[PDB]
Subunit: 259 residues, 5 copies
């Protein structure tokens, strides 16, 4: 791909605006945005998590205006987590901080991630415990070995389906993803506080060091996210993941390319 | 609106300065700035918070000198939380840190937010628990469904009334608010320390990437805030939200539009 | 009307000093500490003794007499003095655990400084409007329940040392045109003192128009609070501990109309 | 070496891409990436850690395209920890946070380190306790004395073998390593949270103040890493180190030298 | 002294490279780098710490190539703590984190400090408790009064002796030290985690706002340091300070003065 000039004029730009909902497991008809309560296996060999207990990567494939060559180039991103103040509900079936106290807030292990690409996010599998039996309905590293706990290059995949790729099994593949920009932070600790910033004044530039953003193959833009904010502790002590939606606004421009 | 040139001259600038007081619930005649003690429902379905237990967004609509087409354009903001040192009162009916110790300070879950716009802040509803029954006197997401726990686009509103829009139900709508600049941080954990900075030397510029600030429709400036600082724990262990007022100073200039 | 800066060797001067903390000083051996904290049974019965209340520190420094010319404050170097004293964890402290070292000073802190050409202007805000403040302090008068969030009647000047309690007062953002102030409350129960020292860091005091505080009557006002946290003695009782703050201000002669 | 001009043209650049796996101890055939459970000696004098309880530095020597003079000069680095999300497995034989709670995450003392050089990383030995008996199969500071607890200049080594140099005995020697760029952070506390950032948008420039990067002697590039993420706590309360692999992408250019 | 031009040419620059060992108390022949276990006095009046329980400032005076007026001017500094990974020894007579857990790491109150000057670092004394009886062999504030707890300008000294000036009694005097650049951070809390960064890519410029670095009187360079990393907790619960050495590399140039 030789990348040539940017098109100009009023017609040369377009914008994508949407929200990606979290896929935390949704264990019943009242618990969208939550996982099933966590159960712990007795041994590594008996680890067998149910599907509704496993948060998954969110993805949307957004068709863009048909172009044909020209390709849509993703240039800027505005993004934030939607509903951050919902975590101030500390009066709803939560374990109390202490006797007579308020409910505990969502807190602890969190992963906040987003990517913008001109094709599906490329994934590499890494397993905490290679003997984990992952559930029907999920897409997980196959033919796992003990080496899968550190790096097994067999575990390559595309984030190409919603509610399918468990967060704990998969990361962006740093050896690929030339046509995607990804950003993620694991804040892994037991007691970490959610720290969530919102503003409509912050922009992320998606251009690489050569001034080129993701180029959208077949006129499709791929947005991906995970926003596991922490765990909710209910009155029994049981804990569930809680996720929130992520807003995306992407500005794109037409770019001529060759080959 | 085609935005044209800025007017110059002595007459062309004005400034707005004020305090927005917090709306934490005010459970009795002595407890302005606090919420009611927090009680916890035994199920999601029975979550039924009383009005005086729910912090709300603060809003002020500030009339500007009448124009007329010229519009007042908001260009800069100075802001800070007022009364930060009041949280050093650790001697007033607080649960002790330990036997013989000082009173516990306000701490834990906090939300600090402010916005400046030329019209009401536009809101999107998101619910922790869609089955929460919000109380009379509040304005809250209607026709809630389980999808409201993550995103239901029916829940659109304007922050157009003080003491009314509960903080926990509503956020700035990122799909709108073209004519407002908003800024907020949730620091959500149980044990988080208030970290509150004050200074008269810091300015936030409100101009967008094209050099245009909020334009005040009908010559009204809208300021909105939330400053839930954390929770105060009294000697029984009961906990209540504590908030503080926010100072705003906004500089505006006259801008011609078509 | 602010006109040109005077140049020449005679045209600059510098002020250097320490402001000591005013934490309450409950006896002849406890300078820098407050009285141990006692807790009221109710908001209505809150009645803190004077020696339990840290206050704002202030110094008015005379400058070389001029005369219109005014001294203009341009730069500030500042730091807390004696940060390492908080490593005394062997002096009547509650132990971390059985056989452990003494607990260090920690918890709720407020670090604040200002440089101005006149007294720092204060606004009152009260945690609890029914607090009875003690004789010897200067506190918000005619307090009402609105004083807990904002009562614009509570205006004052920081014009006396050992008198304005930290918990009652903050810099008034609606005034202080002729002062630059900087403060941080780190309010939590377990927060660690994080105190940096260096002689290489300078704060510029000029506003966006290039004008620093102008010293009325050839006086410079320095104000500070450095409540570092609380010390816990072996009984579990807790008291505020404060430290002194160093100021070095560079000033230049400025003509005004 | 006198460093002269950079070569240009399409053939003047090359790239190295790989991952270094962690060497945490691997106590059995199922526990790659973990150490043996941590035990504690009764005294300093009796400290004798097992080989499989001691994380080691990882190293890879990467042959580059043959050049001859010209040398490959390392100019940029992209790097990140691979598999950060695996730490969200809180359902696999972990000690519960509290009764009925989720499993505890990996947390506590961590060391994250990487280097890129034109020759082996040069090491200096520093011992927590000079009487520690390091195990057969490891390469450790020899002729240790009480001064080795602060600085004993006898303890010099090259990171020239895998599963050999224990992390706790060795650091980069700041008195050497002219031809290497190294970066590391110890976050030492008992309760510290892993904070692990990933992105493909971040580059580190490896040039020194004179615009010269590591020069690869014998056309070999040396990559070294440690990523001890914290400790995993199993249901018994026992704790073991958990590490993750590190990705490296290095861009190099031909430089003439005399 | 008037500061005039920098000398140039091959002969005009030199470099100093060394390490300063920590002076934590060294309570016996096996415990270099540690203090004696901390004991707590019953009252302020009875505070009487033993010498081997008091960490002290470290100092080295380094001779430079003889000049002559030319003076060596210190321009840049690279520095880091040496042996950061030794703090991963959590298997040697430590108190366990919990039942069956690993040993506790070094953590809690820390002070990391370094300075570079053309003469001895100038100190100001401040005491936590003015009635503390400081031990023979230490140099401490004399004629202490209650004012010494906040500021007693009588307490002036020079850091001109190793293993002598207790860290807790003394700080850099900000009213002096015109010919020294100093940097320090107290991280004072009971549970603070050591956060120790190492890299050979970071430089601190020592020049003042007029572009002048420390000028080395008598061709001597003064380096000073404290790196109290926290406390180690042994199995009995007793706690002792642990320090580490600090690397310095300073680049100097010849400067003419009149």
């Amino acid at each position: 791909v030789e990348v040539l000039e940017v098109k100009t004029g009023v017609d040369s730009i377009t914008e994508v605006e949407c929200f990606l909902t979290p896929e935390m497991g949704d264990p019943d008809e009242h618990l969208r945005g939550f996982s099933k309560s966590i159960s712990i296996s007795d041994t590594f060999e008996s680890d067998s998590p149910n599907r509704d207990m496993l948060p998954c990567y969110s993805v949307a494939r957004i068709p863009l205006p048909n172009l044909n060559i020209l390709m849509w180039e993703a240039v800027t991103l505005k993004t934030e987590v939607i509903g951050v103040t919902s975590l101030m509900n500390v009066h709803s079936n939560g374990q109390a901080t202490h006797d007579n106290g308020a409910g505990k807030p969502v807190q602890g292990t969190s992963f906040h991630f987003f990517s913008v690409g001109g094709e599906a996010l490329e994934l590499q599998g890494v397993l905490f415990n290679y003997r984990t039996k992952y559930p029907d309905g999920t897409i997980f590293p196959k033919n796992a070995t003990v080496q899968s706990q550190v790096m097994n290059t067999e575990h390559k995949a595309y984030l190409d389906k919603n509610k399918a790729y468990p967060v704990e099994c998969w990361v962006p593949d740093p050896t690929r993803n030339e046509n995607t920009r990804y950003f993620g932070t694991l804040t892994g600790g037991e007691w970490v506080p959610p720290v969530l910033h919102i503003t409509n004044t912050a922009t992320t530039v998606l251009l690489d060091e050569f001034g080129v953003g993701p180029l959208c193959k077949g006129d499709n833009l791929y947005l991906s996210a995970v926003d596991v904010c922490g765990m909710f502790t209910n009155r029994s002590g049981s804990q569930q993941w809680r996720g929130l939606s992520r807003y995306f606004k992407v500005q794109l421009r037409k770019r001529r390319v060759k080959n």
